[PDB]
Symmetry: C2
């Protein structure tokens, strides 16, 4: 995860500058997909921008923030080749990389505070997909897509 | 949410008996898609069973349990007509009903303890979808499905 496409709605935006700064500090190139203010806007559009960038290989992964991260991650997961984890603790983030090869992480600005959110990001970026027995399971997910 | 399709893998199974018993205590009729023991099994199959039930209108919603809930909910979200929330607290569950009309709830037997899980289930079951400005956003999720 060297370059990441970032997206958020107006509610997720409250964490944007700090999370972007944290990613730059961790040495990742952030491709910013918006939004750019607290002006009311629709989360599915930003989900699409990040998801398209990840699925099309222009970026290694995506990070998405809304009020809870849930709606924005449901939208992302609708795209083929996207496996998005939403969570409020770092164990789920870490294991989803290890077992599910997640390429998109989401969380909620009204659920997690900033420093917990930073720890979830670190746990996600720090984990490696373990393949092995988990591969046939991940392949089952793809099969669901292409039916 | 009067009829719920339930599914889990062998790790999610550690919460099955008490979560199913709790749904029944709250007057929910549970359609059990398995699994039925702690023998190793693959979570995508139980995701499909629940998703196909919800999508085909056989039940009102779905509940899924694995180690974290994430892989099983990612699988479920790949099905047309499913909006699945995974979480480890009740706020996300509740708001996902209110704003996103979620029809599947997932959580992790290795992430949340039993009584917190019951509270998440209660919040999800008790919340109403509010429609309004949210329907446009939900319609956009469906548009991605095509």
């Amino acid at each position: 995860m060297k370059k990441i496409a970032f997206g958020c709605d107006h509610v997720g935006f409250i964490l944007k500058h700090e999370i972007v700064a944290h990613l730059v500090e961790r040495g990742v190139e952030v491709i910013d997909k918006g939004t750019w203010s607290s002006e009311r806007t629709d989360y599915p559009h930003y989900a699409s921008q990040v998801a398209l960038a990840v699925a099309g290989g222009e970026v290694d992964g995506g990070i998405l923030i809304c009020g809870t991260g849930v709606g924005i991650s449901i939208a992302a997961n609708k795209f083929a080749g996207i496996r998005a984890v939403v969570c409020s603790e770092p164990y789920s983030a870490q294991l989803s990389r290890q077992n599910n090869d997640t390429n998109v992480l989401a969380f909620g600005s009204r659920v997690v505070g900033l420093e917990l959110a930073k720890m979830i990001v670190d746990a996600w970026l720090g984990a490696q997909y373990e393949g092995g027995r988990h591969q046939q399971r991940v392949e089952a997910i793809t099969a669901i897509e292409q039916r």
